[PDB]
Amino acid sequence: KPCDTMKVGGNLDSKGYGIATPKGSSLRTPVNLAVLKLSEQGVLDKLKN
Amino acid sequence: ANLAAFLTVERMPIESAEDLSKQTEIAYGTLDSGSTKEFFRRSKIAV
């Protein structure tokens, strides 16, 4: 609300949001695998909806 | 003045695939099995 704005036209580009960690972080591999697990189990679609 | 506007404008709701892509009130599809469906499944064109 107040529902007074609108998206017009197609997207100007195509890209993605990612979970970021410091270069060389110990968390890089587990968090990359978790995002793929959350992707494959449908969690990311449910959360956007 | 308004009659002139009517005639001048008349002298010069989907018109394209871009139109279909930008909206959702009008549904659109293809043959469930065909080269048309494959054209879309593999198109690298944004629209």
Residues of B near A (CB-CB distance < 8 A)? 18, 21-22, 46-47
Does A9 sit within 8 Å of B47, measured CB to CB? no
Which backbone phi and psi does A40 adopt, to 5 degrees?
Answer: -60, -30
B21 is in an annotated binding site: no
A6–B contact, CB cutoff 8 A: no
Partners of residue A14 in chain B, C-beta under 8 Å: 46
What is the number of residues in chain B? 47
Report the distance separating Cα A32 and Cα A23, nearest Å. 13
Q: What does the block give as tokens for B34?
A: 């065909």
What's the per-residue H, E or C state across B1-47?
CHHHHHHHHHHCCCCCHHHHHCCCCCCCCCCCCCHHHHHHHHCCCCC
CB atoms within 10 A of CB A31: 13
Report the distance separating Cα A39 and Cα A44, nearest Å. 6
CA angle A19, A42, B20 (to 5 degrees): 95
**Resolution given for this structure, in angstroms:** 3.5
Identity of the residue numbered B37:
K
DSSP state of B34: S
3-state class of B28 per DSSP? coil
